[PDB]
Subunit: 341 residues, 4 copies
């Protein structure tokens, strides 16, 4: 009587998933969000007088990924599907640039949000249909991790998040994570609890701990390998309309505590969203968290698109401005990494 | 209290009434809209190749014996050679259109090939479109296996099928479609009828708890399970009376009587075996829900056998189609 | 190939089913005669009677020896003392009940205790030694059990909380399985209090959630629904609701919540009636029965106030015995026929 | 904001965390001296000593009066009598313990009972009266509790079934919450027996399912993990397994199963061991500690065999006190050093 090999992730894949997961959530570093859609790229390119063409998107993302030494501060890069199959102007596959900097490619694989019937606009995350085939293709193209956004909200008067909300989120997250790992992708698990409301931080801690207990029990039920998975929740914070906002030390305290109360330490890392300005509250919050411990999980940042805002402004679509632009990107990347510690 | 917490009185009434009509006394559901390939096996006994849908739909009086018809999506938008939409022909007969909306099966990772049913993505939009085109019920098939040595059906299997069914059902009702819930427990294996009874009760308990959690209106839903039987390689086959007994017991043990009907899958049985089993079930006193057995395949079969591929036999082909529809229908009374 | 020890035996299943069917008779009801020494002290004081064991025996003899009472009473709840007690003329109480075909039963829980770190939400205690108690009670002639679980409705405080529901359903399932392991019919009692100003739609919602969880739990614990009974509260508005539901509304919602959650294998559903034929509960169950035939039998578990006028008529003095019994006989009668 | 009644207070949380941290000391272990009157009657009969309260008191006093014992002992399990016992010089046993910094605790469950219609799978009884017992125990000086749950592994029979796991988790979480509501640290004890021929991978799989369920339930019942301790079996092959695991494998899978399921807020995990320094468990725990620093402390809860040599050195002779204590001391020392 033994466990069948078909019931476990193989040695090869478990080692790959663990190694990649560990590299992606590096404390010195962060994930570059370079996955704007055509529609979002239009707004950005417009701000600098650049025409939104496929070729120019290739110029822009070559500008990002070919920045010499970026991998010292950037652990991974989120790509739009177009970019995953795209070559630079000089003929170099985007994934090859990333590889040259040791930056790990990833991609969003969900199909967005849909209201759960008979809830007060509480949301399910869709995308399981054809997800395995997508993950296979993506891995073959060079992606090594996935994203999948789930959303919960807090509203005590309306009983949010309802049981159904939490059940759905946990199930979707677990299915998506197992499917990812079946296709050799590290899943980034993302139960995002919105800050909408005037609840204070203790409420957010309570909700967070309940949601995370549920999510990890679900991950265990679906045979998800925590050693090859990552967690990206919101930090534990007061609601945006709370009249008594938490301090950075408090946010650090409650976030570390919720994680330690619910996250098994087999999970190698927990990441949080930062808007990529080194002085912003998310930086301060994470720095305060790192002052504590050290922890059973690596802490790291997933950077919003604004990280490369100045890079864009420096470049302006002008070839001659590449070096300058890339210099700027480095200094932002470095400074955000350093701000964590 | 509150507004968007409940199904409206209007919609709940429509769903309840349509579920009632679908699971009507003395009637069955016609399953004769079939694909290109699957009618090669069907044709090659009658030996014609390539109107048929017209032959099925233009059969006057069929509503007496047929409560619903299963259509493909394309058929919903299709018109008669006289410009009449197929769904308007079905409507004139009082026959309710329905459609299978799941996207088939996919292995649950790290299980021994137990299956998730796929198809929630875009499902709500599809359902809205189908209602607009005239569909009033939907069908979703989940599959589970029995294998005591391998712990099948596993907790993950049961959990996934219950989740997918409840999700599907809630979405259907959100788009004014009656959901037909089909948790199919395969008869593979050597287990006897007591094992199937035990598993069926566990599965249906999980499924109806999930349906409650997802706010599914039972009054506007329908259940389509296998009858409870011995496994196909079982050395001690169950009698008709035993099948009746354990099937009725499993249902009474797990299914709230707000559900208007239970319409059994053919499950690999003969038409007359299924008829006999249902008869033994009817012997077992009045039930809180309508019980039906499936026979669309047999109807389509004998109609095709009458047709033989010649345009001359149309009338005859329709007459027998009515006759058999009657015989099967009245067998359920 | 399922195995013997995984299911209630045929004989015991038959016994449980038959006793359950008998307990939930439509024209009849359960007599609540299980006053504690203290309660019975109170309303013995109400008629100037010294609360002694002998006088309690007099009183319950007077109840259970009413000739014909079995036409309107299907079961009787006893205090433990009474289960082992003889009438003053030497007849075992259970023998008196058996002569009238009245089935004896008894409460087996040990009351309520707050769930830690909840807002005063309650677990029902009583599982320790419960099996042994049921065995002995059966041995003494008991054939059904009672176990009160409590939940509250409070939207502002998220009540009933998931932990409340989970605890109640676990404890109920546990209790019921043990009962049946000792050949007792368990009366499953998830009582949802009427505290609050919520209207009837809120109570219907909560009742349906709670009952769904309860019956899933009963299934998880291998409980035989065929040999069990349910006694919930009727679905109603809150005691402080400004817009109260009507009798017809109450019937509609109660029947609907049951049909939406209770599997038909369950042979009966009982409700609390205060023992008067004209009160709200009677009219409610009446509207319920007017609403066509049901998968479950509907019945009444009468409160200790039913035999009150019998006690007033008795006044402890022996000469009134017959008289007292007459009163009882009519009372039950009036309460029986009113259900249908 | 969150209600203060929804959380363990700062003072109590701090007390629980500190006591838990002290109990799960890596260089130490828990002394088990909670024999009942019968058990101690057997152990005394082994060395020709009359089993009286006087002699029991002498024995307990000899154990707990060992000066310096607090170096290798962080806790002591007492039988209820011992908690209220005094030395011949009138010093409370718990005060002797306090002087050595050794923390007292007590087993509070009421043993196992078969879950109905299971193949003799066991529920743990003891929740009735548990809160009151815990309050009294704390008042007498108790600071931790023990509660043993038992599961088995049998693939052909589908053990541990869902009901077994569900029950174990429910009982453990209720008990944990009640302890913490009375300021006791609960040691949570989901014991998975080694009966069977399965190999270590099966045990690991089962352990991970069981622990996942236990910890979800601990969360559902608002159990403060910072003030709790876990005491599972090590992950090993079954006792009849033909292909036994190595010490390194046992360490690997045990550590893995814990890291896969146990949140790092839990200060420590303790395993069961005999009083033998070079026994399997000691080498296993040793192999575990070598696997770098862990998110929780690893420790030992010793069996009643630890003091067997002390008990034998005593010989019931008062003059033999001083030496016997040395025998315990040494016997403790090795056991502490064989862990790290």
């Amino acid at each position: 009587q033994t466990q069948g090999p078909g019931s476990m992730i193989s040695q090869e894949v478990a080692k790959e998933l663990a190694e990649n997961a560990r590299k992606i959530a590096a404390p010195g570093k962060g994930i570059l969000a370079a996955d704007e859609s055509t529609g979002t790229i239009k707004k950005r390119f417009d701000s600098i007088g650049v025409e939104n063409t496929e070729a120019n998107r290739a110029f822009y993302r070559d500008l990002l990924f070919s920045t010499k030494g970026l991998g010292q501060y950037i652990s991974g890069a989120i790509l739009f599907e177009e970019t995953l199959y795209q070559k630079s102007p000089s003929g170099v596959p985007m994934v090859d640039l990333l590889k040259a900097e040791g930056i790990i490619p990833g991609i969003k694989v969900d199909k967005g949000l849909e209201t759960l019937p008979l809830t007060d606009d509480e949301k399910a995350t869709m995308g399981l249909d054809g997800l395995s085939e997508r993950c296979k293709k993506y891995y073959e193209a060079g992606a090594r991790f996935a994203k999948w956004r789930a959303v919960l909200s807090i509203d005590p008067a309306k009983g949010k998040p309802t049981n159904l909300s939490i059940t759905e989120v946990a199930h979707g997250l677990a299915r998506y994570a197992a499917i990812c790992q079946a296709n050799r992708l590290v899943p980034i698990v993302e139960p995002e609890i919105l800050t909408d409301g005037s609840h204070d931080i203790t409420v957010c801690a309570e909700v967070t701990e309940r949601v995370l207990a549920a999510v990890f029990k679900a991950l265990n039920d679906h045979h998800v390998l925590l050693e090859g998975a990552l967690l990206k929740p919101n930090m534990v914070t007061h609601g945006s309309d709370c009249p008594k906002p938490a301090s950075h030390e408090e946010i650090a305290f409650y976030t570390v505590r919720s994680l330690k109360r619910t996250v098994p330490p087999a999970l190698p890392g927990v990441m949080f969203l930062s808007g990529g300005q080194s002085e912003e509250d998310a930086s301060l919050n994470l720095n305060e968290m790192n002052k504590m411990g050290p922890h059973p999980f690596q802490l790291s940042f997933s950077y919003g698109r604004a990280l490369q805002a100045s890079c864009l402004k420096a470049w302006k679509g002008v070839p001659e401005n590449k070096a300058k632009a890339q210099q700027v990107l480095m200094e932002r990347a470095r400074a955000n990494g350093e701000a964590q510690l």
